[PDB]
């Protein structure tokens, strides 16, 4: 059954909640974003109003073929009335089109679903800066102390000065990056600009970055593989065998494939920075995983509460155990006594 923190109290709404059937008692069913975990139940066959940001939007229609007349897109920063609620729709840092909600209760409470986010100091200049938060929906993907991790800034100009050094070594290296999901476009970009490439992929991921508004997209990216000279894969292909076997199919156009894998959080950032990075290596293939986030790291989070400063948090991410529920229930506990809310 649909779990409480999908539902927002003195509402007909839930949030992220497509996978339950019908919810007894749901008026409209807002997506935060689209990855899968949180659009999973949606297709052709609703019959329910959806309330989104534009860009998810268009990938509800184009993707998923959701009809028309039940998505309803919302510009960001704007107060907008639903069923008679004042909402808005704040940029969440996430991937494109991903959406922060705010709600204010007709009894005066004011609630924040923060959907998935990367918590930036930049949130703290929003609309959310003009009335007191009293619940939090809170995305705690990365709760922990471990969780350290380098700015977005940061990686981007890692992978740019690694592959530009590569290929200006050896004109016939490929650049290989995968990808699972929309998210971290950046880093397939920010190469192919670098290299003065267009990024080739498959006709199913280019449909879906024509989706996301990207300014000049046309002159950025291409179905045309052979013309290119940074490729997007399968984050499933991204391995020796699966690489090895790509070069076969350029027709010895390339020797060497430089590829990255764009994670979350591994085990070595407790361990190693950024300028010291290295990869794996069998023969003219190279793999280097990069720790791009699209996460609030842990003192990202800490700081953006303790700045917000609500009344109550409820956690929306590893709410499965009882051991991660009273660990998360522990640092909220800390920075409250922290900060003096
Ligand atoms: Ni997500």
Known sequence: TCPFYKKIPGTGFTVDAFQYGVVEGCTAYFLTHFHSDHYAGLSKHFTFPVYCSEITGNLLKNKLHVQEQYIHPLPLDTECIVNGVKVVLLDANHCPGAVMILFYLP????????????????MERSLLADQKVHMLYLDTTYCSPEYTFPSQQEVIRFAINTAFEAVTLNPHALVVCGTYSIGKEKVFLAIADVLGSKVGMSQEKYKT?????????????????????????????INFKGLQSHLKKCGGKYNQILAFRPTGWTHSNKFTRIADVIPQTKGNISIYGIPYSEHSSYLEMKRFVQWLKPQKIIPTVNVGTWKSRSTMEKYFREWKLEAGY
Do not use: K, W, Y
């Open 107 to 122: 009894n005066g409470t004011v609630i924040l679903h923060t959907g998935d986010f990367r918590a930036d100091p930049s």
């Open 209 to 237: 970055l024509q989706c996301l508004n990207i300014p000049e997209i046309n002159s950025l990216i291409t179905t045309d593989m052979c013309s290119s000279l940074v490729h997007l894969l399968p984050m499933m292909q």
